[PDB]
């Protein structure tokens, strides 16, 4: 029995009940998709009592280059001859990075989150199905509200260097209907409707409307010019699918950047909006019955970070995270305000500081949960709640977590994943 470092997919689970982090043994990620590479996770998505993710292919690591003298290698003249790369995409020689497989898309659908015995399906109509930006790998498969899961792809891997690793296929979506173990017949070619563009990432809305977050221009590694929301309608003109940009937010030159994670409630997405350069953040309602955006709540900060609804008893209210960045520091408030729609909250009061958080994750008006990335390093997780006196408390238990780069919720579960090394026998 031989040991040997290989590509896994780590698990972890924070509990919001019981309060207690959790990691599951690391999953083998070599040949995940029966053709040697190895997977990173897109999404964490509960939906028919089940959990579905996107294994995005990575390419082959240096054990699946070697394995059985290259016989996972189809192009060898991509096999990497020295270490190189910057960032989270550096390499090392004998890597194959980025997959060879690029026009095709896999889902894996887990009974529950002890993560045994993946129903794993493929498409060819569209290219793998995430998001990119740095790191981090966006969810874009969501459930429509009767349980039919859409699978979006923004066809990221058009922009590869190499031919044969950029995909051929146009961003689209396809259909698992509820309770189905296959992909259906249904399929949009989103890049007709949408003036050619792509986009960065997706969530759902409502019924089967969907956001998107849409490109001016060319999709890009920078996200440059991800400055449009577009309402997707699903089952839209006779089940082909309808895309309609959303009028009434900013021009997009002078949007910086937008929060990253609607709020959703009572049938409308609630999104912040950051301004270029005397112009501050401010929450959009977008109502995708009409694709129209109005203008809200102000946050008399940098930026906004999460959107969400906190309870206890009888009081609730909602929380927006505001970030207060300085020439030297970068902050961090959660603010309580009645209202979305309307006013200006400000940091200096019913704030509370907090550090800065790569991911926020709202468990359904419970619990608010900060997710922290630090490179190669391990991740940082705190979470909030509301007290019995309305007021915004930190909870007491904090976690220093496996390095991250996707999350979700299932069940009493948020849990978060990535690709890592580790010791496999055989
Ligand atoms: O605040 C953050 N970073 C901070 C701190 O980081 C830094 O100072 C530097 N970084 C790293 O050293 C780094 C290191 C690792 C790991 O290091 C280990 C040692 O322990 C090695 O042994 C392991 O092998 C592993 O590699 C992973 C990472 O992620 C890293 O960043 C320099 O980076 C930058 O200066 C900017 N970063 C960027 O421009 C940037 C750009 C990309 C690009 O994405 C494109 C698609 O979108 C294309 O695909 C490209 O191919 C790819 O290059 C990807 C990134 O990861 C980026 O950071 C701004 O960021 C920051 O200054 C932060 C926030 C959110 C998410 C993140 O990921 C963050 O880093
Ligand atoms: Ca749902
Ligand atoms: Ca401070
Ligand atoms: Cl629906
Ligand atoms: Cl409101
Ligand atoms: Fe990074």
């Not at 300085?326 to 400000?346: D, F, K, M, P, R």
């Not at 709640?385 to 996707?406: D, H, Q, V």
Request: contains cysteine.
């Amino acid at each position: 029995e031989t040991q040997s470092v290989q590509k896994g997919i780590a698990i972890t689970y924070l509990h919001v009940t019981d309060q207690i982090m959790k990691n599951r043994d690391v999953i083998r990620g070599e040949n995940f998709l029966g053709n040697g590479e190895y997977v990173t996770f897109a999404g964490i998505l509960e939906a028919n009592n089940k959990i579905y993710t996107a294994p995005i292919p990575m390419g082959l690591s240096v054990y699946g280059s070697a394995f059985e003298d290259g016989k996972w290698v189809k192009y060898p003249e991509l096999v990497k001859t020295e270490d190189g790369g910057s960032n989270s995409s550096s390499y090392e020689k004998g890597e194959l990075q980025w997959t060879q497989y690029p026009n095709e898309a896999w889902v894996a659908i887990y009974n529950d989150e002890n993560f045994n015995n993946p129903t794993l399906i493929r498409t060819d109509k569209i290219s793998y199905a995430c998001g990119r930006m740095r790191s981090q790998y966006y969810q874009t498969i969501w459930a429509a509200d009767n349980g039919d899961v859409y699978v979006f792809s923004p066809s990221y891997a058009k922009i590869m260097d190499a031919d044969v690793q950029k995909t051929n296929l146009p961003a689209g979506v396809v259909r698992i209907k509820a309770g189905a173990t296959d992909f259906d017949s249904y399929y949009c070619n989103l890049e007709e409707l949408s003036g050619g563009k792509s986009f960065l990432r997706c969530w759902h809305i409502t019924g089967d409307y969907f956001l998107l977050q849409m490109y001016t221009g060319e999709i890009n590694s920078r996200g440059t010019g991800a400055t449009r929301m577009a309402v997707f309608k699903a089952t839209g003109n006779g089940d082909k699918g309808e895309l309609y940009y959303v009028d009434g937010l900013p021009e997009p030159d002078r949007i910086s950047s937008f929060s990253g994670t609607p709020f959703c409630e009572n049938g409308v997405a609630y999104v912040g909006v950051i301004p270029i350069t005397t112009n501050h953040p401010a929450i959009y309602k977008i109502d995708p019955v009409t694709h129209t955006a109005t203008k809200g709540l102000t946050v008399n900060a940098t930026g906004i970070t999460a959107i969400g609804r906190l309870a206890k008893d009888s009081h609730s209210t909602y929380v927006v995270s505001a970030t207060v960045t300085s020439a030297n520091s970068t902050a961090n408030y959660l603010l309580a305000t009645s209202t979305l729609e309307s006013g200006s909250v400000t940091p200096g009061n019913n704030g509370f500081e907090t550090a800065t958080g790569t991911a926020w994750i709202f468990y359904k008006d419970q619990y608010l949960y900060r997710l922290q990335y630090n490179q190669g390093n391990e991740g940082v997780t705190t979470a909030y709640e509301l007290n019995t006196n309305g007021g915004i408390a930190k909870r007491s238990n904090e976690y220093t977590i496996t390095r991250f780069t996707t999350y979700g919720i299932f069940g009493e579960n948020i849990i978060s994943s990535s690709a890592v090394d580790a010791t496999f026998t055989d």
